Design goal:
The structure is cut from a larger assembly and holds one copy of chain A, two copies of chain B, one copy of chain D and one copy of chain E.
Chain A lengths: L1 E5 L6 H9 L13 E7 L2 E7 L4 H4 L9 E9 L8 H14 L4 E7 L9 H7 L11 E4 L8 H8 L3
Parallel strand pairs in A: 1-3, 1-4, 4-5, 5-6
Antiparallel strand pairs in A: 2-3
Chain B lengths: L3 H7 L1 H4 L5 H17 L5 H12 L7 H14 L7 H12 L6 H11 L5 H13 L3 H17 L2 H4 L2 H8 L4 H16 L3 H11 L8 H13 L7 H13 L3 H10 L8 H10 L1
Chain E lengths: L8 E6 L3 E6 L6 E5 L4 E5 L4 E6 L8 E5 L4 E6 L3 E5 L9 E3 L7 E5 L4 E6 L3 E6 L5 E6 L8 E4 L7 E4 L4 E5 L8 E4 L8 E3 L8 E3 L6 E5 L4 E6 L9 E3 L5 E4 L6 E5 L5 E5 L8 E4 L5 E5 L3 E6 L6 E5 L3 E5 L37 E7 L2 E8 L2 E6 L4 E4 L4 E6 L4 E6 L4 E5 L2 E2 L10 E4 L4 E5 L2 E5 L9 E2 L5 E5 L2 E7 L4 E6 L1 H10 L12 E7 L6 E4 L2 E5 L4 E6 L2 E7 L5 E6 L4 E5 L5 E5 L2 H11 L5
Antiparallel strand pairs in E: 1-28, 2-3, 3-4, 4-5, 6-7, 7-8, 8-9, 10-11, 11-12, 12-13, 14-15, 15-16, 16-17, 18-19, 20-21, 22-23, 23-24, 24-25, 26-27, 27-28, 29-30, 31-32, 32-33, 33-34, 35-36, 36-37, 37-38, 39-40, 40-41, 41-42, 43-44, 44-45, 45-46, 47-48, 48-49, 49-50, 51-52, 52-53
Classes of the chains: A alpha/beta, B mainly alpha, D alpha+beta, E mainly beta.
Organism (chain E): Mus musculus (Mouse)
Family (chain E): Belongs to the WD repeat COPB2 family.
Subcellular location (chain E): Cytoplasm, Cytosol; Golgi apparatus membrane; Cytoplasmic vesicle, COPI-coated vesicle membrane
Chain lengths: 159, 272, 123, 139, 604
């Protein structure tokens, strides 16, 4: 399943990824020269695309299409800055329309002590309840804990 | 025997979920064939390919890797994107064998942007240093194109050359010099010292002797003064070898109407 | 009104003069005023007229590093000449003659008055 | 020193199914081919110690049924060049353990391509030691 | 390439198996722990003992100075931690952290911490502000904890070595490593860090005689090194030069260049094995415990190679070991004496040979630079090699047009434009050679004077010095000779006659040449001719110029330094450190001259 894990270079998405995937991590920069990775979970056979989002490519991040069906959208939770507004909305909407054919599960990262501004405000802002829509989960994490990881996958490995 | 248009659609089928390593390998061969005899190329077709090729990368399969390089290598002066590749590239680089690495540089070199360069320099440092020459050799050639492109910054690197300057593989010994010359050849002077540099020196992967000859003469040629003490040193040596060609090399040049020293030449000649 | 006269005339297209005359004889030897392939390379030729001497300066502002600008030529003398002026080659780019001059009027009936060494500083 | 202006792999039947033009200077695929017609044809089925066309060096190994070519400038050393000419020639041969034919090529098309890239890469000869090579590769 | 280099046997002691060494930077004191069980702290400088402590009489494995803290930390293998305030050696506190043989302490400097590893297969962290809390315990062992080192770079993250052969690198959020890697095929004795922050290497030690380099960011064994002569007790990163220090279980020093990686040298103080090492972070002085004793060596130059054109560009090359690629500086702006200034940016160069001399042409112009023992002279603007050869010793013919050389034999040949000058060809015992206006050959603890065209022993004076600076026009000349110093006149005419007459003294040189004007008893940090004025530094850090019977300190300097250059026009002195901030103080040359002239009776 082409499941796209998204976010920037510099996020430390990658850190997570291999933490999960390999057990072990790697730098807080998500990739520059991509990830395609395969994971069996629950012995079900999965492709992870991990994007160190970086702009030019970011622009092109649409860049591929076929066989799309699932989103890890990594967003950094505590990110007080790049998260919402035009960017957030735009990305979400665009993605949604383009591939209305895949569940969007957003991943909120390095929650540590959360350095956001309200779990509630944001979820709403994202129109998390614009829902009447595809399997969704809003999910909390600080990477080091991995505050919600296994469910994401688990609940996911639901059919 | 076979035809392009169909194929062009069909190649993406490997990109379709299809598992059968062979099948695609073959199809790839054909493409290359179309190409080999002669083929139009272009972007759209490329771009679509860009997404197409890209997914296909859980392959472990080494040989599988090979195939890729080639293809990519095809894209160079008409190249499209690099960032994706970075990760990939990195993968060759960290990648166990040596092998993977050489192909990547090789496509890269007509095609690329200043910028990244810095980064990739480091990698270069490493290549520069490695004992299995080959890759290092692989590294070098790329540079040339990079010289095409530019290569000046490559220049900056002279130092590495030196660390490198110690060599013990013949062919390899050869390779280093080629570069070098270019480098100093923008410069008489050093070279004069270079000469000295080799002067203490004999040569590993000969070949080296030969470029140097052209060279060694080439300063002298204009009247880089003294034939007499230097040249001659070279010559006895030159003379002496069973690298008959080298002997020749000297011989051929010295074409002197009065016989600069008519005599000796005749022995060489006899020998000829 | 020598070969050198032709040079008196060649010189003549300029009009910042402070006397000339007609050239008498010219230089027995042009002097490279900057030695062998310098940061800047000068070869100089000196011209005598019945009245003045002009040193006209031939050259290839060498380094592609540079173009020299705001160029004038100082000369400072020991055995006489009245020093009228030092000339600026407005601009000199790489590998290229341009002209700069330095001008003097030649005293003739004095004991010690036209052979001279002049000291040069490029600005 | 970029020796291969171009390299061609040729029929007996005076055609070329591989060529990698190390550098082109008269354009086209086409233009290469016309040249073949003269040259190959003319040469065809017979080789030289030395052969020249106009200050350029003409290099190459044959088979009864097949033709190999390298072009460089005749302005430089027979021996090495030969050595090379062979180096290829042998390597492949050895490698193959067989005389290439028309057969050889169809018999496995891939190997050529693969081969083609390793020694010379557009122009210069990177790779060599054919046995070495031969061993070196197999994958 | 040569050892034409600084190696100093800085300080010695012959003793026992001195296991451990720890450095007091903040005042260069050193702490050492012995296999005796007594530990001592020394000021090496005069081979003087700052304090010694009998902490235990059991061998005392671990030691730290806590400088911030102003206290010194100690532990012996009574498994207790004893504290002294080093501010006497007044002993603050004691408590039992680790209950087994306590091998190593690593400290967070930024943050108030003391990290410890001990053989109990435990690493404990203790917090001093909490007053030695066991704040956290780091565990993930498989054996005794032999060593801890803090990646101080990221203090915060640290690495651990064990002889079960493995290394765990940890994150705070891992009271366990982030991971363990399977390093040794022996055991990982030691783990060490790469001085630069930029890149990252560790070296780890083994006696297996194989070295692996690792890059953390990738996470690779960058490479694995072989060549060795005996179980490497230790090998270390040179932090000053790029060299590899290798050490042995017999106490062998081998150096491989951490760039050539060629064995540069082997040294034997067969004082047996490398027990400890500790290094100057200022990267220049290092100490290691050996059995027969310990030795400390001093290994530095005091400068880069640069010479300044009076336009105002001190062109230096390198920085400290950076490529030569970096020369330039014409600046562009002005500011207050005390305050600091800006540089331009446009490198030229990227030489190879590593120098230690720069000297300008006499008009700044042609520099001859020596390095690796050979002389590259540059055409500078040109960035051309003006010329090259191998030295031994040198004089520019001061005039700016010839040069002399001392061939690595010792017998003179001189070249003017690659022509030997044999009109002059003594080749007597020397010591060093001096050029300038008047020829010096320093020989036989004498300094002997020579012509410029034929040699002549003009004079010989009492002893040998160290350095000469000549006034500008030569005239009054300044020779630096330890503490002590002299100013002289050279009187020509005598010579002309004398010479004509010929019959002379030259054993002494001829007593009819030079005169001894006066002498200052002097210590020079750096020194200057302003003309014939000696403007000088003292290493006592006053900048003084000896003027008028007077020596005056224009100013006194932090500690003493290098004379940037006074571009006279500006009348200012540019002062120079070695850290590339320039300070300027204007004088006004005229004032000096004014003084000079008037005394001379040039009042008007």
């Amino acid at each position: 399943m082409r499941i796209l894990m998204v976010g920037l270079d510099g996020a430390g998405k990658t850190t997570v990824l291999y933490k999960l995937k390999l057990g072990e991590v790697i730098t807080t920069i998500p990739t520059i020269g991509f990830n395609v990775e395969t994971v069996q979970y629950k012995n079900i056979s999965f492709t992870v695309w991990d994007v160190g989002g970086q702009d030019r490519i970011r622009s092109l991040w649409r860049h591929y299409y076929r066989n799309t069906e699932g989103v890890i959208f990594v967003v950094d939770s505590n990110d007080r800055s790049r998260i919402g507004e035009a960017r957030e909305v735009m990305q979400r909407m665009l993605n949604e329309d383009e591939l209305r054919n895949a569940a969007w599960l957003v991943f909120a990262n390095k929650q540590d002590l959360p350095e956001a501004m309200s779990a509630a405000e944001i979820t709403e802002k994202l129109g998390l309840h614009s829902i009447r829509n595809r399997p969704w989960f809003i999910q909390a994490t600080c990477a080091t804990s991995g505050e919600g990881l296994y469910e994401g996958l688990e609940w996911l490995s639901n059919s | 025997h076979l035809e392009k248009s169909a194929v062009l659609q069909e190649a993406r089928v490997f990109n379709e979920t299809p598992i059968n390593p062979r099948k695609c390998a073959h199809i790839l061969t054909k493409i290359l064939y179309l190409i080999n005899q002669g083929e139009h190329l272009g972007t759209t077709e490329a771009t679509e390919a860009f997404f197409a090729m890209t997914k296909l990368f859980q392959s472990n399969d080494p040989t599988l890797r090979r195939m890729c390089y080639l293809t990519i290598k095809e894209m160079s002066c008409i190249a499209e994107d690099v960032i994706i590749v970075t990760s990939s590239l990195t993968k060759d680089m960290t990648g166990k064998e040596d092998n993977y690495r050489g192909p990547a540089v090789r496509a890269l070199c007509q095609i690329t942007d200043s910028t990244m360069l810095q980064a990739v320099e480091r990698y270069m440092k490493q290549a520069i240093v490695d004992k299995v020459p080959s890759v290092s050799s692989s590294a070098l050639v790329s540079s040339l194109h990079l010289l095409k492109c530019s290569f000046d910054v490559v220049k900056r690197w002279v130092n590495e050359a030196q660390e490198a300057a110690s060599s013990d593989n013949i062919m390899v010994q050869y390779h280093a010099l080629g570069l070098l010359y270019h480098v100093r050849k923008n410069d008489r002077l050093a070279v004069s010292k270079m000469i000295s540099k080799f002067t203490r020196h004999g040569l590993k992967s000969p070949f080296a002797y030969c470029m140097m000859i052209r060279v060694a003469s080439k300063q002298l040629e204009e009247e880089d003064g003294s034939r007499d003490s230097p040249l001659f040193d070279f010559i006895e040596s030159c003379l002496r070898n069973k690298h008959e060609m080298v002997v020749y090399e000297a011989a051929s040049a010295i074409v002197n109407l009065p016989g600069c020293s008519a005599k000796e030449l005749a022995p060489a000649v006899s020998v000829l | 009104a020598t070969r050198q006269e032709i040079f008196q005339e060649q010189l003549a297209a300029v009009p910042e003069f402070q006397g000339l005359g007609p050239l008498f004889k010219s230089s027995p030897e042009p002097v490279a005023l900057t030695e062998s392939e310098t940061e800047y390379v000068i070869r100089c030729t000196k011209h005598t007229f019945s009245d003045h001497l002009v040193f006209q300066f031939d050259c290839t502002n060498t380094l592609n590093d540079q173009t020299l600008e705001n160029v004038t030529v100082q000369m400072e003398p020991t055995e006489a000449y009245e020093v009228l002026s030092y000339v600026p080659a407005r601009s000199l780019p790489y590998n290229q003659p341009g002209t700069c001059y330095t001008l003097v009027a030649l005293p003739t009936e004095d004991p010690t008055a036209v052979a001279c060494t002049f000291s040069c500083v490029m600005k | 020193l970029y020796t291969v202006k171009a390299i061609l792999i040729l029929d007996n039947d005076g055609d070329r199914l591989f060529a990698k033009y190390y550098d082109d200077t008269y354009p086209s695929v086409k233009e290469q081919k016309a040249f073949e017609k003269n040259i190959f044809n003319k040469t065809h089925r017979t080789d030289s110690e030395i052969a020249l066309l106009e200050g350029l060096t003409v290099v190459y190994k044959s088979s009864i049924d097949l033709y190999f070519y390298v072009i460089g400038s005749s302005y430089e050393n027979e021996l090495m060049l030969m050595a090379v000419l062979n180096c290829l020639f042998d390597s492949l041969s050895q490698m193959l353990r067989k005389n290439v034919e028309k057969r050889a090529l169809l018999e496995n098309m891939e190997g050529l391509f693969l081969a083609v890239d390793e020694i010379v890469d557009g122009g210069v000869i990177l790779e060599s030691d054919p046995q070495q090579v031969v061993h070196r590769v197999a994958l | 390439m040569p050892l034409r280099l600084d190696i100093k046997r800085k300080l010695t002691a012959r003793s026992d198996r001195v296991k451990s060494v720890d450095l007091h930077p903040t005042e260069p004191w050193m702490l050492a722990s012995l296999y005796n069980g007594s530990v001592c702290v020394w000021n090496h400088e005069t081979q003087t003992l700052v304090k010694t402590f009998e902490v235990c009489d059991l061998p005392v494995r671990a030691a730290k100075f806590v400088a911030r803290k102003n206290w010194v930390v100690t532990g012996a293998d009574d498994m207790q931690i004893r504290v002294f305030n080093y501010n006497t050696l007044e002993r603050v506190h004691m408590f039992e952290a680790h209950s087994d043989y306590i091998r190593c302490i690593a400290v967070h400097p930024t943050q108030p911490f003391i990290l410890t590893s001990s053989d109990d297969m435990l690493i404990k962290l203790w917090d001093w502000d909490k007053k030695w809390s066991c704040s956290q315990v780091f565990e993930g062992h498989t054996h005794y904890v032999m060593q801890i080192v803090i990646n101080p770079k990221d203090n915060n993250q640290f690495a651990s070595a064990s002889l079960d052969r493995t290394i765990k690198v940890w994150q705070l959020g891992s009271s366990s490593p982030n991971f363990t890697l399977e390093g040794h095929e022996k055991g990982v004795n030691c783990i060490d860090y790469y001085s630069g922050g930029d890149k990252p290497y560790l070296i780890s030690g083994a006696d297996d005689r194989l070295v692996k380099i690792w890059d953390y960011q990738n996470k690779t064994c960058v490479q694995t090194l072989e060549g060795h002569a005996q179980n490497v007790s230790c090998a270390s990163f040179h932090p000053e030069l790029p060299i590899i220090i290798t050490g042995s279980e017999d106490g062998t020093v081998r150096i491989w260049h951490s760039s050539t990686y060629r064995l540069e040298s082997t040294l034997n103080y067969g004082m047996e094995r490398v027990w400890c090492v500790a290094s100057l972070r200022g990267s220049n002085n290092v100490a290691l415990g050996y059995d027969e004793g310990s030795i400390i060596v001093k290994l530095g130059r005091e400068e880069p190679a640069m010479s300044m054109d009076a336009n105002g560009k001190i062109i230096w090359a390198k920085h400290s070991e950076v490529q030569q690629a970096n020369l330039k500086a014409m600046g562009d702006t002005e500011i207050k004496d005390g305050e600091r200034l800006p540089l331009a940016v446009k490198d030229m160069g990227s030489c190879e040979i590593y120098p230690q001399t720069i000297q300008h042409n006499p008009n700044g112009r042609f520099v001859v630079v020596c390095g690796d023992g050979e002389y590259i002279i540059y055409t500078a603007m040109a960035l051309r090699n003006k010329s090259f050869g191998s030295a031994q010793e040198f004089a520019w013919a001061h005039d700016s047009s010839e040069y002399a050389i001392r061939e690595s034999n010792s017998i003179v040949k001189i070249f003017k434009n690659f022509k030997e000058k044999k009109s002059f060809k003594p080749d007597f015992g020397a010591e060093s050679i001096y050029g300038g206006f008047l020829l010096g050959v320093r020989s036989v603890n004498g300094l002997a004077f020579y012509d410029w065209e034929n040699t002549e022993l003009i004079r010989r004076i009492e002893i040998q010095p160290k350095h000469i600076f000549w006034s500008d026009s030569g005239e009054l000349v300044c020779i630096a000779t330890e503490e002590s110093f002299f100013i002289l006149k050279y009187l020509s005419e005598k010579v002309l006659a004398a010479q004509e007459t010929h019959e002379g003294v030259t054993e002494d040189g001829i007593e009819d040449a030079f005169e001894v004007l006066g002498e200052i008893q002097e210590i020079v940090k750096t020194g200057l001719w302003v003309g014939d004025c000696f403007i000088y530094t003292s290493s006592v850090n006053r900048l003084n110029y000896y003027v008028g019977g007077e020596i005056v300190t224009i100013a006194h300097l932090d500690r003493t330094m290098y004379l940037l250059g006074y571009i006279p026009k500006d009348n200012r002195l540019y002062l120079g450190d070695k850290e590339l901030n320039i300070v300027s103080y204007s004088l006004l040359v005229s004032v000096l001259e004014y003084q000079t002239a008037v005394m001379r009776r040039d009042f008007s």
